[PDB]
């Protein structure tokens, strides 16, 4: 339960929200000077994502809305 940072990269080709079932964001702390994002894509992978990116903020927004409204 109590996890070093668990990302050794991150993604940096924009992609498609659709493309998203599932998001981890992990904030800085202790375990991991930076915060993490780790998304599991449609078909299981996963990867993690910088989330300083402006096009992350905004993949990882249009996520949430979607999943939120089901």
Do not use: M
């Amino acid at each position: 339960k109590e996890l070093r940072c668990q990302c050794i990269k991150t993604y940096s080709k924009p992609f498609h929200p659709k493309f998203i079932k599932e998001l981890r964001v992990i904030e800085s702390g202790p375990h991991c000077a930076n915060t993490e994002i780790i998304v599991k894509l449609s078909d299981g992978r996963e990867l993690c994502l910088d989330p300083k990116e402006n096009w992350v903020q905004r993949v990882v927004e249009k996520f949430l809305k979607r999943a939120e409204n089901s």
